[PDB]
Symmetry: C2
Subunit: 652 residues, 2 copies
Amino acid sequence: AMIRKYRYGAPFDTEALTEKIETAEEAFPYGEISQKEGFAFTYIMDEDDIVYGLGESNRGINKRGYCYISNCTADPIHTEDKRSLYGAHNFIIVSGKTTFGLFFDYPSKLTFDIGYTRMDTLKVSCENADLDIYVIEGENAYDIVKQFRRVIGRSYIPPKFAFGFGQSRWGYTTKEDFRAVAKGYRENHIPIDMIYMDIDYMQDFKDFTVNEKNFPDFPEFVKEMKDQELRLIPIIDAGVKVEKGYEVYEEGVKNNYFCKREDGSDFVAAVWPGDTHFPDMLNPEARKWFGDKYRFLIDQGIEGFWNDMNEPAIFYSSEGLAEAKEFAGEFAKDTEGKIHPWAMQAKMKDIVNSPEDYKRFYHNVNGKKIRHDKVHNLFGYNMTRAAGEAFERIDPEKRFLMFSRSSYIGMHRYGGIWMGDNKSWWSHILLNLKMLPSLNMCGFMYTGADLGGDDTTRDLLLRFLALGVFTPLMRDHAAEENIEDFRSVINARYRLVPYLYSEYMKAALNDDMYFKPLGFVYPDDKMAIRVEDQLMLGNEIMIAPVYEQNARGRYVYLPEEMKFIKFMPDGSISEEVLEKGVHYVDVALNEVPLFIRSGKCIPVAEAAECVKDIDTENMQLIGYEGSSYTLYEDDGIHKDYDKKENYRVLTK
Amino acid sequence: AMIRKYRYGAPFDTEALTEKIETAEEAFPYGEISQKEGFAFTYIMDEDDIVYGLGESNRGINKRGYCYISNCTADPIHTEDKRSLYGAHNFIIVSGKTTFGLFFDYPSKLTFDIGYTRMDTLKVSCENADLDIYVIEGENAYDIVKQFRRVIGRSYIPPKFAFGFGQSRWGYTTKEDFRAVAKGYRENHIPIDMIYMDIDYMQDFKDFTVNEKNFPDFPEFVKEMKDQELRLIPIIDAGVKVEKGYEVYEEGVKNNYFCKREDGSDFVAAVWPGDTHFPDMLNPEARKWFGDKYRFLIDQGIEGFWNDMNEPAIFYSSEGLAEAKEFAGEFAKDTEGKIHPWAMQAKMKDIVNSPEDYKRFYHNVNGKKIRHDKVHNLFGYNMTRAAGEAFERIDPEKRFLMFSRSSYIGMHRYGGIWMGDNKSWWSHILLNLKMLPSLNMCGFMYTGADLGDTTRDLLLRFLALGVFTPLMRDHAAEGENIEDFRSVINARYRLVPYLYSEYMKAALNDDMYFKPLGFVYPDDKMAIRVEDQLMLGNEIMIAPVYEQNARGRYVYLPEEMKFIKFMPDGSISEEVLEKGVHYVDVALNEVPLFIRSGKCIPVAEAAECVKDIDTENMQLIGYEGSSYTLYEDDGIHKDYDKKENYRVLTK
């Protein structure tokens, strides 16, 4: 009796929540609901109200003052004005004198006008009034989030090695490229556990193949790598190549597993392999077939995968390619200047990720033909759901590394999310920082981010990693000076793996958040609730990364007394007490900073070069003498979660 | 004596400098010069070294750790990976243990690799060793700046009305559109002095025409607005439309005033009007004629212009257009998947503002046909030089508002510049703030920015910056509690006497309007690294909030100051804040600032136009014992020398 479900029309089932809620047959408690123009919820905000949520969305922790459209989009630019990223996360919480959470359970384009049109007005709208709205109430936002976290079911948990460092690069192809990196890191003694394989390892980008000529005994090569504690983490894309004699393709065609055109034919969408077909992720039979395929690589020693282009992205369709050729031909033989160069340009952008192409193909959902656009936001969800179920069939008791580009609430149980770009910008450290608590709100905990890019200067990479240190996914993956600064930073990471791991485990198992906004921890502190460039982690620290070029430090607000801790290259740990108030603090490039809360402590291992070798048996306790910390640890591999003996109390 | 000139090859005379200084004969006094790859300058910086300058460029005040290409581009998205904005201001100061300044007098593509490739390495390189390098010695950066400000000639001084608020909409096209701005502002008591006219008022986009249909009795309409103290500010564009019987064009052809191709034919480039030619801005004769054409508008009661598109922007040439259709052809007829879409797409982008186009036209300069690419950064500057020089012929006694998009050092004598793009971003408020000191260093002090969909909160914070920037406009595209809007604009008007006073004093003394905390607090290791606060003249520090949804921000104070706030109700709050790190509260409808220890400034009652500002009885805000020299003139003419312009105010 603090959670209500309001149903309108005939909502498609997303299986986002795992707890059942009775339909409310009373009045919608807040705002106006209107069905004149599709569906709209309109609400007038108090001046001080903060709006939390929307997981993977643009701008800040407080969403007030802009427009967000939930419409999973393969856009990779990410300017302030972008309305849509890769995530459809329709959770929000109004935080003011009146406080409530709303989850709009809806698979299609959802529109969040949060102060955009009129500063005082919140307006959520969509084309058809076929959705469920959950209303969550409580003390405050954190309490609201915590109930929500309880109904959407438990968050995905990676194996412990996923808490190491990873490196990848679009362009790695041959055994020698991967041999070259193991050598780089291991011989310069940079810690690391994972090496990503970008698309090039396949046989002509064909899903679930390895390049036969570059990889003649993959399992022997996989084992080669596993013997130096390097786990090869290969990519899988939404598109299956159209190739005669390609087995996946042939079973896809034969068993009616790909999405279909209205006319009955298998829909074609050009991606990296050229012409592909999309597996029908909403069809549970097609989902099992595709999930199962991952066995092919699991059977060769592979322990982690990443799914990509699953919005799904489309460079162009057959219809659109043809449409645009006809235009071009018309442009080509204009001389009366009737067809303009920017019209010809505009037709060319318009065939990439075209709303019209998302209306040309269909899902067969338990017998029901649905057009993709009606449910577009669930695709990548289900692609990840597919793999996550295949894992439970092969070995229910084993955790695999899995993370996806596209997501919808409900996926949070089957994998994590990675934030990527086609650009390396200082502003993106801040962006990625602010996104963190918001992902946590909607259940996405194993997340990190990328520096697309060759305008990665040394310092950008250094500060970028110094945030990455605290993000559960931490890698250096891009397209392809002073080596020892890079090492000191990965050292800091590995010194922190045990505590970070423990905080994540305690959080995941308790339906609690990993990263929190200062607002959640200090809700009555009117300064704290406005800080967006600092986060609280677990119940013990606060992070405040440096994100400005040329900066020798930054400003901070401490909502309470804390120990300013830093990891110094020499392996030392500088420690200083700072009163509640505002401070400027020195943080050099190669230095890694966090603040530990009054009467808290955290354990700190010596640096180790891979996760299995971290000496967790006798760690140092940094923080305040007298304080306790509960350390969680298990085998890091399997699902033996509810043991008293996974918890140990440490005292300073 | 403190400035030496190092010449290599046969440099085009850019006329950036008003001073003649002899060619130095010794070897180059700092770093290694290499003429291996063309021309290169290479200097190893100390870790503590800071790098200043470049005026209108990307990123922060300390330029270290990125790459900047001096190459005026009409590129419109101003993301932080971009290495070329509109300006081209080749003036840098290295500041640390070894301090010195460098002006690279080179009219074409110049690359500043400042810590980018390699962090301690400063490398400025260009294709051809044909350029003058000015080396400038000083005790510090501020010093070095002030000497450079001396040799490049005094900065453009604007009419005082140019110090009011201004407004515009790309879209405005009828007498009724403009009357609705007038009524909306004057009825609601929002101060305002200018209405900008964007391109729609021209006859089919033609320079020095007015829309026959929408403005039949134009001088009359200008008088209509002037009487309400609204000065109309029409835009002018580099490209002159190709049109039979359009006199600007007819004259331009007959007299060879346009940029020609190699075969002597007038170059074609498509802009707003479709086919246009570009006035040969480097031909002193063509400049003479182009500038004179402004008389058409001056004679009608117009007192200010802005030049846009003067990079010059090219949507496409005739030649690039045929290449595109060639390629459209190939694409449309491909069946084997030979030509992919991404390639078709690229050829289209590639024909906009093309490198290859700028190798397709020439300037005739004292009988030398010079390829445009080799003097590219000079075009907009010379377009503005033309207008400015024409003003002295057309109405010699009188100051005109004039400001342009693309520039090059030298331009600063003839007009201001404005920064905009097509995006409404928060980070841009900071970009704009950071650019100013840099622009003051290169002579450009009449500057300001645009927010080219803008939210109410963004507008308000944008405007609390523009309060202090000599150019302050809300110029958008298209066309809740307005008391907030008025409050911010009111602070502007209340502060007009002071900012104009500091501008004039700075203009007349080759000093700076805005300075980095560092120039004022050189011995304060904290202060020299501040980038989001500015000193203005000798009395105040500014610090705008540039974060969405914020109630305030952190500031550093290098000395005791009064924290002042212009208040919605019209009051002025005051707090004495000691030296140190603070957090300060600033609501969206509050305009912050800091008066320095030992100092005071004057503030007027809010007034609704620059004319009616009551500058007799004003209050002094600041510290109880200090005095301020207020510079004030008629704000119209060019009599700056008089003892009458100054009067010491004492608190």
